[PDB]
């Protein structure tokens, strides 16, 4: 699950 | 204004920084995403007298990934150092820990490491 | 408290942590030498609203190692998590960079792990 | 026979090592688990001549978390120290990888510490 | 091949690998220096039994820095992945650690990353 | 989602 | 060399 | 001082 410091 | 100013990564994240004469950072890092949502405070802090060797300027910067939008419940640290001259660099690797129940520690902490550029005046 | 007061690492260090409005870590690192040439300062930030399913707190906070009587050329950054209950502590990997020359870059960073404790 | 035995970490794994007299580390690790799928194959390397000033004893292993049973697409390393005497301990820093697509590298490593204690003869 | 081959990090080190039986890695280590003196052991593992959905091989080793010509009293180990595909790569993440005393422990480890390239 | 590593 | 983070 | 890893 999505973390903020990865997201595109 | 060595430090102070807009840096990318190499992933397209912005740190948009300002150097205090006290040694203190503040700004805002903004996830790839660019919108308002993706936008959170950090501080730090970095050497305000660096030796004139040729050495970088050591640092080290916080994001909490809390933001009036939402919440990852974690937070991640860079440490680092800015060289400067041609092209202007911070090189960093990076702790992400999540808060996790004691049993679930093992999956706390991510580690990397990011490359960031500075935008030229 | 919570994360506010102070706490004491493995080694005699101690952090002095002030957790303010909306997520702002300040206070004061000093290493187990303690007198007045081993006070530095730090900030950080830290999860202003964490979880209630038992996980620990988020936080992390920078101290670079300069203050007005001496300078190291380094900062540490410690990135870890509070954890509440009956026995509070405060759990962290650290990154320890010196400034290096680039040919020198592999010399740059240590890596540790501290525990903070309320004793 | 100081490094070869059996260890313990403080969440109950198991470290089964041999070193050998050219520097070679092999043996099994065990999760907590501790039956059959528990069990894999480790290998690395050692400082077959340390200091003899106090110091410990450099030394490192992987564990692919591969085995007859169960494949969880990731590698742990184990860098440490080795020290002798009395409480014999190995302190180690470790980095848990997993496969993952480009995109998703930063989920890729974990980081952590792991210190053993040798079962005694 | 995929992983094994002759790989090269981005200061000029070589890393000379066999994949082999059931997840062995086997091979040498030779330093940016080239010469005899710099050639090392490494041993490691990895995944023989990737994913198949396109995400990278987990693998790691070690090099104890001990060779018939010196000793560093240390060792590295290397953990990553992997990545096969048009332009090959194995992306890691180090940690070299040296013999210390207790209280010299802090400066034991050191962190840092490479990218090797069949290039 | 679990990992060896960390099972109890 | 001496580090101000480990002195005892 | 010295270490075999980043020599040139």
Redesign the interface.
């Given at each position: 699950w999505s973390?903020?410091?990865?997201?595109? | 204004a060595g430090i102070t100013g807009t840096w990318y990564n190499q992933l397209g994240s912005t740190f948009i920084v300002t150097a205090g004469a006290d040694g203190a950072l503040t700004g805002t890092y903004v996830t790839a995403r660019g919108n308002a949502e993706s936008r959170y405070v950090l501080t730090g802090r970095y050497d305000s007298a660096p030796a004139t060797d040729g050495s970088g300027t050591a640092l080290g910067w916080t994001v909490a990934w809390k933001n009036n939008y939402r919440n990852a419940h974690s937070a991640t640290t860079w440490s680092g150092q800015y060289v400067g001259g041609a092209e202007a660099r911070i090189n960093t690797q990076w702790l992400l820990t999540s808060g996790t129940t004691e049993e679930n520690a093992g999956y706390s902490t991510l580690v990397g490491h990011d490359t960031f550029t500075k935008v030229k005046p």
């Open positions: 973390h903020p410091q990865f997201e595109k | -």
